[PDB]
Amino acid sequence: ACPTTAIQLTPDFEMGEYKRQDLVYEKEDLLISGPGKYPEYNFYRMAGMAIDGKDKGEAENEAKPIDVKSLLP
Amino acid sequence: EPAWQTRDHLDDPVIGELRNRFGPDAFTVQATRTGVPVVWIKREQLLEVGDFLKKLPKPYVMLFDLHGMDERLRTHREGLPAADFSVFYHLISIDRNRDIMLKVALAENDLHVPTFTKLFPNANWYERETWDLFGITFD
Amino acid sequence: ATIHVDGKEYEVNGADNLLEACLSLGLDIPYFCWHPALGSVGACRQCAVKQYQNAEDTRGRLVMSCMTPASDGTFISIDDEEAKQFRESVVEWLMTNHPHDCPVCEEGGNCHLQDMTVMTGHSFRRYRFTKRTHRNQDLGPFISHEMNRCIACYRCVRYYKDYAGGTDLGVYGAHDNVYFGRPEDGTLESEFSGNLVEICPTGVFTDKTHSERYNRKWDMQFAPSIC
Amino acid sequence: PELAGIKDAAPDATFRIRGQKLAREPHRYSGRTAMRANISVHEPRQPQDIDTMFTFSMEGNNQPTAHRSQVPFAWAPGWNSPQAWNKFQDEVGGKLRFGDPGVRLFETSENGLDYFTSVPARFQPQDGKWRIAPYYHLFGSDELSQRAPVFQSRMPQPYIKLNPADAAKLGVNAGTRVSFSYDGNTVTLPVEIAEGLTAGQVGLPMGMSGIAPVLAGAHLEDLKEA
Amino acid sequence: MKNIIRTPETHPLTWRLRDDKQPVWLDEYRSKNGYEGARKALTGLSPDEIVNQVKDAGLKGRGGAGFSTGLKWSLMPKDESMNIRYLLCNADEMEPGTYKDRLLMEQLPHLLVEGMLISAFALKAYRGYIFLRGEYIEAAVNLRRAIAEATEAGLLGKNIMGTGFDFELFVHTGAGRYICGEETALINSLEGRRANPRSKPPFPATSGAWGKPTCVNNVETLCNVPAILANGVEWYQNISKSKDAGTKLMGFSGRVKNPGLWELPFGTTAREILEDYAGGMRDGLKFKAWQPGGAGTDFLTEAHLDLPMEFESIGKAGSRLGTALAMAVDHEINMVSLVRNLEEFFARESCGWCTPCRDGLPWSVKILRALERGEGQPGDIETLEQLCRFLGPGKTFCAHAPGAVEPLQSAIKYFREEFEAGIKQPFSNTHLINGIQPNLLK
Amino acid sequence: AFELSAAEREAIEHEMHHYEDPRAASIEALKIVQKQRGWVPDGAIHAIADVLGIPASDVEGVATFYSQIFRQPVGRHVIRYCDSVVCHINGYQGIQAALEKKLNIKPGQTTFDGRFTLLPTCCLGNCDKGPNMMIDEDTHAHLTPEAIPELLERYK
Ligand SMILES: NC(=O)C1=CN([C@@H]2O[C@H](COP(=O)(O)OP(=O)(O)OC[C@H]3O[C@@H](n4cnc5c(N)ncnc54)[C@H](O)[C@@H]3O)[C@@H](O)[C@H]2O)C=CC1
Ligand SMILES: Cc1cc2nc3c(=O)[nH]c(=O)nc-3n(C[C@H](O)[C@H](O)[C@H](O)COP(=O)(O)O)c2cc1C
Ligand code: SF4
Ligand code: SF4
Numbered sequence A: 001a002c003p004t005t006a007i008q009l010t011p012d013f014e015m016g017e018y019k020r021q022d023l024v025y026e027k028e029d030l031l032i033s034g035p036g037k038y039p040e041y042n043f044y045r046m047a048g049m050a051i052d053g054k055d056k057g058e059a060e061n062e063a064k065p066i067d068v069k070s071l072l073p
Numbered sequence B: 001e002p003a004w005q006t007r008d009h010l011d012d013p014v015i016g017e018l019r020n021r022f023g024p025d026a027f028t029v030q031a032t033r034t035g036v037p038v039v040w041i042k043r044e045q046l047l048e049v050g051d052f053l054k055k056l057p058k059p060y061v062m063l064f065d066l067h068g069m070d071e072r073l074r075t076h077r078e079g080l081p082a083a084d085f086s087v088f089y090h091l092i093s094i095d096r097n098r099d100i101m102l103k104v105a106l107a108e109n110d111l112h113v114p115t116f117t118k119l120f121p122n123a124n125w126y127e128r129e130t131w132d133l134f135g136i137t138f139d
Numbered sequence C: 001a002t003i004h005v006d007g008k009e010y011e012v013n014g015a016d017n018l019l020e021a022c023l024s025l026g027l028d029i030p031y032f033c034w035h036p037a038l039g040s041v042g043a044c045r046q047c048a049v050k051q052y053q054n055a056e057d058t059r060g061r062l063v064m065s066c067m068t069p070a071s072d073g074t075f076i077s078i079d080d081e082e083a084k085q086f087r088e089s090v091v092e093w094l095m096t097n098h099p100h101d102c103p104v105c106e107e108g109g110n111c112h113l114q115d116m117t118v119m120t121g122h123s124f125r126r127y128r129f130t131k132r133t134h135r136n137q138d139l140g141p142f143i144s145h146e147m148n149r150c151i152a153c154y155r156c157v158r159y160y161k162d163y164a165g166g167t168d169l170g171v172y173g174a175h176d177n178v179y180f181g182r183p184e185d186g187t188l189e190s191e192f193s194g195n196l197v198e199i200c201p202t203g204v205f206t207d208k209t210h211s212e213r214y215n216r217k218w219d220m221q222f223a224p225s226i227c
Numbered sequence D: 001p002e003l004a005g006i007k008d009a010a011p012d013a014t015f016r017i018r019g020q021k022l023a024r025e026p027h028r029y030s031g032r033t034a035m036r037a038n039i040s041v042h043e044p045r046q047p048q049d050i051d052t053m054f055t056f057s058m059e060g061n062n063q064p065t066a067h068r069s070q071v072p073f074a075w076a077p078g079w080n081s082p083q084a085w086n087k088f089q090d091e092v093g094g095k096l097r098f099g100d101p102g103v104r105l106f107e108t109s110e111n112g113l114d115y116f117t118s119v120p121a122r123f124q125p126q127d128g129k130w131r132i133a134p135y136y137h138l139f140g141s142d143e144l145s146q147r148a149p150v151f152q153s154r155m156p157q158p159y160i161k162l163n164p165a166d167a168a169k170l171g172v173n174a175g176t177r178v179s180f181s182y183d184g185n186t187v188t189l190p191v192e193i194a195e196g197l198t199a200g201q202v203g204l205p206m207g208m209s210g211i212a213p214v215l216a217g218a219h220l221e222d223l224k225e226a
Numbered sequence E: 001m002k003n004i005i006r007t008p009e010t011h012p013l014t015w016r017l018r019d020d021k022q023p024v025w026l027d028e029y030r031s032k033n034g035y036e037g038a039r040k041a042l043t044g045l046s047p048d049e050i051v052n053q054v055k056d057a058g059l060k061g062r063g064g065a066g067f068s069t070g071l072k073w074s075l076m077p078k079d080e081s082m083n084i085r086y087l088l089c090n091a092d093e094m095e096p097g098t099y100k101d102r103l104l105m106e107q108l109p110h111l112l113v114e115g116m117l118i119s120a121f122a123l124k125a126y127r128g129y130i131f132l133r134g135e136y137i138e139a140a141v142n143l144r145r146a147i148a149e150a151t152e153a154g155l156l157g158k159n160i161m162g163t164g165f166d167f168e169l170f171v172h173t174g175a176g177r178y179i180c181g182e183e184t185a186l187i188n189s190l191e192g193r194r195a196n197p198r199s200k201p202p203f204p205a206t207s208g209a210w211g212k213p214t215c216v217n218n219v220e221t222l223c224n225v226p227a228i229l230a231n232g233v234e235w236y237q238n239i240s241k242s243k244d245a246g247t248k249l250m251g252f253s254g255r256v257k258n259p260g261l262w263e264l265p266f267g268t269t270a271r272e273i274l275e276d277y278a279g280g281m282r283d284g285l286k287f288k289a290w291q292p293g294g295a296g297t298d299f300l301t302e303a304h305l306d307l308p309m310e311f312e313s314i315g316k317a318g319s320r321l322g323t324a325l326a327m328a329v330d331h332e333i334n335m336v337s338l339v340r341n342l343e344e345f346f347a348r349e350s351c352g353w354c355t356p357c358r359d360g361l362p363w364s365v366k367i368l369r370a371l372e373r374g375e376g377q378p379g380d381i382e383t384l385e386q387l388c389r390f391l392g393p394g395k396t397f398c399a400h401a402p403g404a405v406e407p408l409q410s411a412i413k414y415f416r417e418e419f420e421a422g423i424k425q426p427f428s429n430t431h432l433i434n435g436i437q438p439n440l441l442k
Numbered sequence F: 001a002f003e004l005s006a007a008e009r010e011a012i013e014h015e016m017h018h019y020e021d022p023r024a025a026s027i028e029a030l031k032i033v034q035k036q037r038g039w040v041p042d043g044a045i046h047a048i049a050d051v052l053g054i055p056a057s058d059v060e061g062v063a064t065f066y067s068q069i070f071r072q073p074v075g076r077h078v079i080r081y082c083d084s085v086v087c088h089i090n091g092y093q094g095i096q097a098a099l100e101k102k103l104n105i106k107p108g109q110t111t112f113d114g115r116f117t118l119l120p121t122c123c124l125g126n127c128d129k130g131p132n133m134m135i136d137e138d139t140h141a142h143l144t145p146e147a148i149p150e151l152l153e154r155y156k
């Protein structure tokens, strides 16, 4: 159900802890330092929102914004 | 015609047999996507309807299922009797290679159904489960 | 007055609209530009049904439910082939240039465009060309502006001008580079600009106060209260 | 006795539609077993609402075709927008189905009051005194609204309005500070010119910090430039 | 015929037109039987009598739809408390291939002034607005000079010829949009709004400009009526043996030997106009297609060139007459590029009101660009056909989109092979994610 | 810091006299400002809204709706070549390539001298006279690619 391929299920199964309270994995226990089973995908290259390093009209299959005041008909 | 179409199954000869036996009235045929003919039988006719189904030339010999349903929150009930609860009996005839469904409507004040274990002895655990999970009592 | 929907008789008002008569009966007709408190226009063409002349008629004619009176003796059809595929084409046209940013959008499970895209049953895409974009505006501390999400059903400008009497919002531009907003950057000085969050069926006008500390609609624990 | 109608707005806590309560949250309420997991992995019992007709979980009822007047939220299958309210009404754009919340509690009297003979005189401006006129900004004249952190950028700066003739008499130009004394406290506020105001009056935004709403209709002294 | 002879009996419009392409001013207009119809209307005829006279004379509207103007003038309200009626002249024409009003506005302005006078007295309208375009500028100067000369010579003002009827005329030069020619959008633009059209059956005849009863009529429509009230009624019905009464400014345009504009009676075949008045094709062109009306109607082949240029005769040919200004396309020009230019004009010149035109004409533009560049994918011609079927009358808010997609319909129906030849590369809408198995279907 | 001149304000009021509403005179007021100053600046919208009474959003919508109301600074002369179909058959692409070669600009752009602004036009309404192009209220017909530098060099 992830439309960004952010949450993934690794082939690692070596879990099991002493306390149940420590089984609640926070954000620092989940975010890994690389792209996993879907390496090359990036959701923000499809989204049309203004992004640090991505102006309006810079996403895939997306045109540059024509100004509302533009001279062309 | 697609296999998922909402069919009424009035072309089933068991419906014609029921119309010949108990009259064209006294039961309501429901058009569902279950693939089986579903008939709403009144409570006092249930034992004799089951007895008639058990004495057909190719009778309905196995009680496939028997369970209740809470109709109190069901908003989309068109072509259905006024029911607070319902009890459905799913019966299978192997010689006909067909199956029928028998729905009995119930009100809140009288959740009493005549027992079905005198006809199908596997109904004991199904009626116990209906009395456990629902409030339906079997006489 | 009585009407016939899908060969079924219904007793509706004769002095009201056909779209609101059908929606009052629990029937589902998609709509974008119509609001119960703003009247009816033709800014979209989403409420299309097929109207006949008499009881025995096959061809019909595609009319708008929000622009046809619900007079006595009308014979309309909602879920025939032609009206359904035309409404699918209209949501396809509206979603032809729509940004692929639903999970990062403020509407999410509150969006009317999502419900009317699912309701028309349009999932596959055959539009392979480029989309359309617009620059955003700073509308103040309460209204976040994301103009790319717009489908140009004119409900915001109609509410803000005709209903609310405000002098800030408006329509600019032309055929396809149409714009809905202020002539400059600034705060919407009308006292009813917050209703644009739910008046807009898309994520253009959204709640900035809910943009900060945001959750989806299904995650909200609601209660009926008094302001 | 005159408040006897408040047991008609909503039914008792022992009110159920087909035996069940009404849900405060939707059926797709996510993350129930990890919501409180940062402080206790053991999921606590749900809060018990004995006061009212509502349950704090999703195990309730929010059906549009349910015999009730008060709806927590509008949701219908296929209608996830705020346009799901039309499923909760008998006719759309009209009254809500099965009535409306809240009863009127007031009945019109058979006979009216008398003609109030007390007609006030004209407002004559007086030297050395100023009549305070309320302005009542929407975003700044409510006690619970100013404490909201998002309103603080929306309220205007604390100001005071003066007539052009009054400002010419005081010799103060618009935008500069003026000092006025009330309850023995000389406070300085920036002035602005009000064209529609009248002579002998001064204008204040009520409800703000330091400016009470009861200051309307009161007098003011010592309008001196700071 | 090789030489054209124009007489007032057979050419009611441009018999007084000057050969040196110079404007006919007031003295030359009244010398060549000027303001006789206005005199008869304002002296000896009741306004209802004039309305019924135009109704039985069969002056159908020359805007392009062919609605009878007697019906339009008869649907004005009968209430005497509504005395703020308006008359509007749709002088804005921005349809490609249509230039019929430029001639009558540049070198015959007093004919339009007299027609507006007669129509305003027939409708009891106290104000008239010539809604012009920003590109007709010499026409604007000529119209303003004609208005000044008329209001100097006792016309067009107050107490006209001692009748007591007050009428005054303005020229409203538009700021430039193709949608402004539609009568409801003309009303919205005249009110200085964005020129989005309005919805019928609240008609301009009952509630138009500023809520008052108005009517909008073309320049040709208002220019035929002085001939009706100056020459006669049965004369107007007896100039052509067809049920489309009157004369129309016909003419071919586009790479012909003599492109121009000639007044001809209805029922004249398009082959006659092309091979006689237009001179036919030049040396090397084969005349592979034509449109009856410029750019709004749909293409016809050589077999439809023999039909008379009438509303109903071209109606049964899967087409319509339109402005009756024929548009000729030769064999050397690709139909894909021509329909691409048509769709580009209709996409960029439409208004921004309703969904299907707004978001289907640019899609047609992009599909036709792909067909131009040879980047066509399988499923584009069927998309264009579905687009044409879903942009017909009634499906959109106004009639811009059906007139836009009629050339597409005729290009698909007749010249299909070039559209098939525009498709070369296979369908690819989605690209790989490299971690997800694609849903490849058969 | 936009300020309407006396002649502009008198023209706007005189056009206001001709209609039942100043809103009807909004479009002609925008045309007067465009004629006087070449284009409509940002403060002119508020100036028209102040002299009329209608909101500035309506004035901005009117200014951005119609094609020949320029909201960007244009050159001293606006070249307007016909983009329509009859001029496509007669050939407008040759004269467009000639204009692009002579001016070294694209349509929608202006030259670095601030002299010419190249734009397409919906339709000139002179289709029977070959290719068509309008410069500064002057139409030109029967155009050829070789006649473009001669026709361009007689303007200021
Ligand atoms: N430059 C030009 O001359 C152009 C002409 N056209 C033509 O415009 C036509 C489409 O124009 P529309 O106004 O949308 O079509 P239409 O046929 O609905 O209306 C044309 C006229 O008929 C009148 N009318 C029709 N039915 C009426 C009724 N029941 N009651 C009162 N009045 C009634 C309208 O008021 C209007 O004046 C097309 O035939 C097209 O050829 C289109 C584009 C450009
Ligand atoms: C999109 C559109 C554009 C139109 N443009 C013009 C036009 O430029 N000139 C014109 O006379 N009629 C135009 N019309 C037709 C008008 O709606 C109307 O029929 C005409 O102005 C007057 O009708 P008449 O023929 O009875 O005089 C247009 C219609 C539409 C739908
Ligand atoms: S901004 Fe929203 S309300 Fe306004 S036209 Fe666009 S989709 Fe409709
Ligand atoms: S407004 Fe657009 S981007 Fe946002 S949820 Fe709706 S469809 Fe998706």
Ligand code: SF4
Binding pocket: E179, E197, E350, E351, E352, E353, E354, E355, E357, E358, E396, E397, E398, E399, E400, E401
């Ligand atoms: S069809 Fe619709 S969008 Fe197109 S010009 Fe007409 S009203 Fe405008």
Ligand code: FES
Binding pocket: C019, C030, C031, C032, C033, C034, C041, C042, C043, C044, C045, C046, C047, C048, C064, C065, C066, C067
């Ligand atoms: S809801 Fe009827 S056309 Fe928009």
Ligand code: FES
Binding pocket: E096, E097, E098, F082, F083, F084, F085, F086, F087, F088, F123, F124, F125, F126, F127, F128, F131, F132
């Ligand atoms: S097509 Fe160019 S002038 Fe009309």
